[PDB]
Design brief:
part of a larger assembly; 2 chains; A: mainly beta; 2 domains; eight-stranded antiparallel β-sheet; three-stranded antiparallel β-sheet; 2 helices; 8% helix; 40% strand; globular; B: 2 helices; 0% strand; rod-shaped; Spike glycoprotein E1 (chain B); virus like particle; Virus
Chain lengths: 163, 49
């Protein structure tokens, strides 16, 4: 109920969709002065400022990143590495964090909702949704996250389908 | 007398063969060891999550 409204209020201005002949196939992320955007989602950036840049690539970590200018670094997402197990907020409701794995209940999940960040009860991004795999009743996510040392860890289960 | 193969090769010529033919193998195997150490270190820091 109110969780989706809080997601729409937090991700209103900072989330920009990716257009491809009128089709919405992905979402970029503006956090820490960096613009995260995946490889398989191909299209034009809806924002005029973020589209006229050059994104350095990382095909192993499946991420394109760029440098957000200084006049927009205050209006970004927050990020942290301290995260316990339990529940977190996602755009379609809740997501479970168990044994270092993000799980989403079934019914939701198609092609197009790639790049949506995972939020917490305070308002900090803990993961970035990149893919998903159907596991019985409860699907698992293939995402990226950080740690205490500062190494971007990409978690990928078996036989995932890119969204 | 009777000629031999590698009969007129000098110790200078053996040096310029060896230091440029086995030294390339030394450089490629330390490239392999460096790549293996980098791969193990990056995979080792990933194991925490």
């Amino acid at each position: 109920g109110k969780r989706q409204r809080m997601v729409m209020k937090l991700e209103s201005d900072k989330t920009f969709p990716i257009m491809l002949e009128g089709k919405i196939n992905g979402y970029a992320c503006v956090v820490g002065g960096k613009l995260f955007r995946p490889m398989h989602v191909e299209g034009k950036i809806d924002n005029d400022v973020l589209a006229a840049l050059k994104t350095k690539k990382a095909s192993k970590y499946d991420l394109e990143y760029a440098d957000v200018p200084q006049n927009m670094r205050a209006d970004t997402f927050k990020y942290t590495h301290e995260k316990p197990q339990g529940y977190y907020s996602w755009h379609h409701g809740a997501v479970q964090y168990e044994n270092g794995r993000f799980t989403v209940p079934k019914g939701v999940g198609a092609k197009g909702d790639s790049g949506r960040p995972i939020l917490d009860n305070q308002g900090r991004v803990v993961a970035i949704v990149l893919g998903g795999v159907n596991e019985g009743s409860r699907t698992a996510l293939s995402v990226v996250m950080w740690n205490e040392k500062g190494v971007t860890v990409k978690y990928t289960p078996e036989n995932c389908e890119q969204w | 007398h009777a000629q031999t193969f590698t009969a007129a090769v000098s110790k200078t010529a053996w040096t310029w063969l060896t230091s440029l033919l086995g030294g390339s193998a030394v450089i490629i195997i330390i490239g392999l060891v460096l790549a293996t150490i980098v791969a193990m270190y990056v995979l080792t820091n990933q194991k925490h999550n």
